[PDB]
Scaffold this active site. Structure first.
Site, PDB file in Angstrom:
ATOM      1  N   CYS A 109     -72.820  59.577 -39.973  1.00 46.29           N
ATOM      2  CA  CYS A 109     -73.306  60.047 -41.265  1.00 46.29           C
ATOM      3  C   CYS A 109     -74.680  60.719 -41.035  1.00 46.29           C
ATOM      4  O   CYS A 109     -75.549  60.144 -40.378  1.00 46.29           O
ATOM      5  CB  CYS A 109     -73.397  58.881 -42.250  1.00 46.29           C
ATOM      6  SG  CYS A 109     -74.320  59.228 -43.773  1.00 46.29           S
ATOM      7  N   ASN A 151     -84.840  60.182 -33.473  1.00 48.16           N
ATOM      8  CA  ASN A 151     -84.178  61.499 -33.430  1.00 48.16           C
ATOM      9  C   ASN A 151     -83.479  61.857 -34.749  1.00 48.16           C
ATOM     10  O   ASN A 151     -82.577  62.691 -34.740  1.00 48.16           O
ATOM     11  CB  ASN A 151     -83.152  61.608 -32.279  1.00 48.16           C
ATOM     12  CG  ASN A 151     -83.425  60.788 -31.046  1.00 48.16           C
ATOM     13  OD1 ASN A 151     -82.648  59.874 -30.692  1.00 48.16           O
ATOM     14  ND2 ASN A 151     -84.536  61.090 -30.374  1.00 48.16           N
ATOM     15  N   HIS A 198     -81.384  60.162 -36.639  1.00 47.92           N
ATOM     16  CA  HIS A 198     -80.016  59.697 -36.814  1.00 47.92           C
ATOM     17  C   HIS A 198     -80.045  58.435 -37.674  1.00 47.92           C
ATOM     18  O   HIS A 198     -80.960  57.612 -37.548  1.00 47.92           O
ATOM     19  CB  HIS A 198     -79.388  59.316 -35.464  1.00 47.92           C
ATOM     20  CG  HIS A 198     -79.330  60.428 -34.463  1.00 47.92           C
ATOM     21  ND1 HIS A 198     -78.369  61.414 -34.539  1.00 47.92           N
ATOM     22  CD2 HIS A 198     -80.077  60.628 -33.353  1.00 47.92           C
ATOM     23  CE1 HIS A 198     -78.591  62.210 -33.506  1.00 47.92           C
ATOM     24  NE2 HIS A 198     -79.613  61.778 -32.767  1.00 47.92           N
TER      25      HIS A 198
END
Ligand SMILES: Cc1noc(C)c1C(=O)NCCC1=CCCCC1
Ligand SMILES: Cc1noc(C)c1C(=O)NCCC1=CCCCC1
Lengths: 268, 269
Positions: free
Chosen positions: A227, A190, A192
């Protein structure tokens, strides 16, 4: 890999790969951390939870709810060598309305000796607003049938290294590594940033002399903010002491905190 | 993993890991490249060569000589999914006094279908002076007993993509990614940057829209110079073209010293 006889924990064996080792011909801490998340994912799949890194149940997906790591604690006694067989056992447990806990035990398959252990605290949050929720009741029942009902702690000691408050590093930092960026290899399904990349970023501000004369024994890390793909990180380290350090990861510009931790190193 | 029945090649099976996959829920090209290097290392160990990434023989170590990758060529037809079992077969061959070649064939273990293939050219070099030297007869005989004596090519085609000259990218580059640095995870046992990191750096200057609408089909890369622990890299890409082609350049952040140049061919998803 497979769930154990009682179905309340999962085991998996790994053979350390040539590219997974560092200067000491032993596994890097990022390889160890990747092996922990691999067995944790295989346990989530074996009991029907999601396999996207969030370990969601049916009702959690209905309410757009996910599990996120708030804290991690790893202690390594012996790093495995290239070609070694390591056995990792993992289990999860309910921490009331606070959240979840996931524990790991690492063993050398040839000797059966415990070579490492880990613990992690997870919190429930809405995937879009990022607002934390206290664990309800209909969620506790959907996932408690997979947890041992009696306490089972990888770090059982009453008030030990895994439950100590981490302070914020004050400027100026003794050591620093600026302009760190994730690459596509560091992103999940996804997009990330992988949780293990943050561990590597913390360790980038450790001086090369410490790395060449010491081995990492303990690492405790708090995950404050995620982040993004396009974010740039600054890694800060100060000696607090064996050798101990205080760490801080923050965004390159504004200085928004993403992580803070501690490392304990032993002489070679 | 194990050497095959004739001892002239090596096979190994892998189960794709959760953290080894990207956006498509399929293996990243860096995972594929890491799996190729893993089986290549296990083959080097099975026949007695060094396992430090240089695949050196006894006489090579006596003369301070090592094998270094000069060119890599990978073609992927189907990327494996999370939990899939892939089988990789590898072998090496003598290319006269020019150097060596290492080939790979990737197959899906369930269907036995070829899902990818790779080729690489290696050159002999003095470890310290970095001067390339022609392969001598002493070295040639110490490794020829491990190579098939008849040609065995992963890319046999008479005019294929693995043997085409790569041009130098001219400024201005259409796309770029600046200030790339290796981390400790990207270093080997002797603190050298892993060969797969350079592949990832090349692909960092590819726009996110291409990555989200296309899959990487072919990648050819030339290795000109080694990037050190403390070096900083700039990644440059320009479109050259249902398919999309690009020309690539990796160079040092300041002076602009070339480290790599390559080409990528992408197919619509
Ligand atoms: C459950 C589960 N389901 O999918 C995954 C992936 C897991 C898992 O155990 N992830 C651990 C994350 C982590 C590991 C090492 C560094 C700190 C954070
Ligand atoms: C032989 C041998 N002995 O140790 C190692 C390691 C190998 C090996 O096969 N390395 C391949 C290097 C590489 C991988 C992916 C693309 C770029 C080049």
């Amino acid at each position: 890999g497979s769930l154990t006889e009682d179905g309340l924990s999962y085991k998996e064996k790994f053979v350390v790969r040539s590219y997974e080792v560092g200067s000491n011909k032993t596994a890097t801490v990022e390889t160890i951390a990747n092996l922990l998340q691999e067995v944790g994912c295989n346990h989530a799949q074996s009991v029907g939870f999601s396999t996207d890194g969030f370990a969601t149940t049916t009702t959690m997906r209905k309410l757009h709810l996910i599990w996120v790591t708030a804290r991690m604690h790893i202690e390594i006694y012996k790093y495995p060598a290239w070609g070694d067989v390591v056995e990792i056992e993992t289990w999860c447990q309910s921490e009331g309305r606070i959240g979840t806990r996931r524990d790991w035990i690492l063993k050398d398959s040839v000797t059966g000796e415990v070579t490492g252990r880990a613990t992690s605290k997870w919190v429930m949050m809405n995937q879009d607003t990022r607002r934390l929720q206290k664990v309800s009741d209909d969620v506790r029942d959907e996932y408690l049938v997979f947890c041992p009902q009696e306490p089972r702690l990888a770090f059982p000691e009453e008030n030990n290294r895994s439950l100590k408050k981490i302070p914020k590093l004050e400027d100026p930092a003794q050591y620093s590594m600026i302009g760190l960026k994730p690459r596509r290899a560091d992103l999940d399904m996804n997009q990330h940033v992988n949780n293990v990349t943050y561990i590597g970023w913390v360790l980038e501000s450790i001086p090369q002399e410490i790395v060449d004369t010491h081995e990492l024994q303990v690492i405790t890390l708090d995950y404050r903010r995620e982040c993004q793909q396009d974010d740039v990180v600054d890694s800060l380290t100060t000696t607090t002491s064996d050798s101990q350090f205080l760490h801080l990861l923050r965004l390159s510009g504004d200085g928004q905190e993403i992580n803070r931790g501690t490392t304990l190193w032993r002489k070679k």
